[PDB]
Each structure stands twice: as structure tokens, then as C-alpha cells.
Amino acid sequence: FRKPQPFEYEGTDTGVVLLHAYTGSPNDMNFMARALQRSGYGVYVPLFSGHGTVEPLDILTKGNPDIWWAESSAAVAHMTAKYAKVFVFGLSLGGIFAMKALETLPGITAGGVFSSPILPGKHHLVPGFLKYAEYMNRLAGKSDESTQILAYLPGQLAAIDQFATTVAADLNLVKQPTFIGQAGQDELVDGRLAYQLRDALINAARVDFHWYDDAKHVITVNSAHHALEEDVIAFMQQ
Ligand SMILES: [Cl-]
Description:
The protein is α/β, with parallel strands linked by helices. The chain is built from eight helices and seven strands, in the order ββαβααβαβααβαβα. Bound molecules: chloride ion. One of its GO terms (molecular function) is carboxylic ester hydrolase activity.
């Protein structure tokens, strides 16, 4: 098993922070990061605590939204030290921190989300996490950990939602141009909430909203990624 590491591409004038998904890793952003590099952007993809190991329990016992927020904030600061302009985007979980960054951190030009409605709703992250863990255990030749996982999973999902509702309540603080991309066949989160995210951004200079009709949740990796990359790059060029 290869532990995905954080990675960085050097640019000149503009840098981009890409924040990965829950149970995800910097691998979530490989295609996006390279697309940005081909267009001359600097890119930084951090690793969230507890992620990127062969042991799914690490996510539940070594990471939490407060740590991940600190890591997101540190990632933004790393890039704003170097580049004239910095953009911050996030996939699902990462999108929560991307929006909180726009709301509360200095020096960010613009940013937004990939399949991250922010407003909590009906989701399928419990089955999603369990399927992820089952796949990881099958890779590592390890026995099932579902009972151990279920002692933590409801609580951590609740913690993420709790963090998210605060971010949602502060959406009025966002003044930067904001990008919203949402999968149209999203099996993990309620895509309808992306419309509520859009409508809550009452003070954003602009809201660039894109719906990826036939795509499943992870639009940075699946069939939608070429379209998403083009739309994100067009947004940045504006
Ligand atoms: Cl997520």
C-alpha cells in the first residue's frame, strides 16, 4: 500500500490550495492539480490528519474537524506567503474548510467547492465510510472493523456537521468570487443543497455555479473532471 503524501507544484503569480474529501487523500486532487499546473498555476494539496493510511480507524481516532481546519488554515498561509494571488477549493469535506477560509482568513482572492453543499442534509457517508473501510481491509488482508468503526463514526459525522453549520451561518461573510461545482448523480450528499449554498452567498462578488449532469460524487476524478477543470480555470482567469 502506498501512503499518499501531501504534494506541491511551483508556480509564478498564482497558487491554489486543494482540500481533499473525508476518507479521501491528496489522490482526490491528482487530475485537478495537474490540470492547474499545465495552465501555469502553483498548487498545494495537504494531507488531513488520520487519512492516507491502511487503517480506516485512523480517520476516526487521529483526525477531527478542528485539526483539519488548522491544517487547512496552515495550507492557505503556506501559499499566501509565496504567491500574489491564492485560490482555495475543496472537495466535500475540504469544501467546508475552503468556504470557512473565504469567510475568515486573509489574503484569499477567490475559491469554492466541488460537491460540497455545506448546508447539512440527507447524506450516505455512513455506508460510504463502511464500504471504504471494507475495501481498505481487503487490501491490507485485515479483518472487518465495523463494530469499532460504529463506536466513532456517528460522532465524527456529527462533529463534521456541527462544524459545517457554523460555516453555513457565516456564508454572509464571503465577499470573494465563489465557485460551486456539484455532481448531478451524487450518491453521497444531497446535491439540492448546492442551490441553498448559492443562495446564501448574498455578499459574494459573484457565484459561478456548475452542475455536472451525469456525474457521481467525486467530480475531480470521475467523468466530469475535464469539464470541472475547464470551468475552474475559466473562473480563475476571470
Ligand atoms: Cl467528504
